[PDB]
Amino acid sequence: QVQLKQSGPGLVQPSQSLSITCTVSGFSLTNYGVHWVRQSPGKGLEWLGVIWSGGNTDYNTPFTSRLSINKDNSKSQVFFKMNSLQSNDTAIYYCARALTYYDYEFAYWGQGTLVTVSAASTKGPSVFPLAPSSKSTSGGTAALGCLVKDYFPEPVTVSWNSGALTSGVHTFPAVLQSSGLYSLSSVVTVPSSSLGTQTYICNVNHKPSNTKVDKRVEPK
Amino acid sequence: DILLTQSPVILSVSPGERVSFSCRASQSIGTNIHWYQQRTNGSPRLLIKYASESISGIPSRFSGSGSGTDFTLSINSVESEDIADYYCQQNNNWPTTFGAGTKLELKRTVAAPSVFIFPPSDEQLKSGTASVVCLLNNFYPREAKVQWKVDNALQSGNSQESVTEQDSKDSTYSLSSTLTLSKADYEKHKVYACEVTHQGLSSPVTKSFNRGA
């Protein structure tokens, strides 16, 4: 029942600042320090700093002047704030808790927060069906999918039939198009005979633009 | 800061084999090293703390050793679900630092891709763009060629590929090739074909459709 949940992924403009909330449960901020760790293309896993039980903070050397960590013990919330972001601050940001109150053995992690630094605007995606067909069958097995196109920034979550359908699902890594917008597909293979009985819906969520689309996918 | 070097960057083993991850430190760090597993879309998962100590919920097949500068993360009998990245962390010296990681991939028998092609939806054609998608599903090894042809014209530069990480259950990959066209170009031609080449196919497989049917 120990958990850390972070605020949603988002875009930040160059030189602007980054704010993330880590809400914890199954323990008390008065008893444990919360650490912040990011993971970037440039530097991999990188420890950023910590807020201790009693409110003291330590910040990693290159972040002394642009990092502030605060908390609200009663609300079980820890607040991370970093100023003056540049492109190479694009990274997944994590809060984490150690096993023991004073240590650095990170046993519990938040789900991460993908932060993109860019001057671009947020754009929600269009969802298009990848319809099952004769040219999409294979010995009693049909492939079908969703094309999630022209969004920014990453990430987008896709699930099938509201979480209920997982077997045979592949959600591909997003590719960056020349437009500078991203695109990905998510596919699933199902029995051909279930195409008449079962409904198939990809649930698309692009949190940075708050775009939620449920796309029904049918034989054409 | 203490530099941690993980070697090699990539490990490829068959299931049931033993596998060692190496992590070397730029000066002695005693036994103050922790190891993590990171799966696709996952947060780091703590496997071993202080070089050799167990963690609740981590399978017994994971263990670690070493002291001073040379450490080993061991999986004695590797399973398909161990497909992940593995990191080491030192905390003998402030600030705690992480190695750059080692990728663990599994070997398995050759598996030919199942191939499926999808015309652009009429929905998308309204927007003025056409995407043609070719899916290569559940194959091994990763290397594959997708060739696009429109009315026998070779397509080049106007497609993009994405490949899933290795599946944790069956150790296969899947690949999508998206050919992108203007609607105008799309409505100007009839035959859309993707030809797939792979080690598991005795000859290339072509999936095609005619715009319309």
Partner: peptide, 12 residues
């Protein structure tokens, strides 16, 4: 060898 944004995994 490096962390990939689209993948959340190491890629080369």
């Amino acid at each position: 060898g490096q962390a990939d944004l689209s993948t959340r995994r190491l890629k080369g």
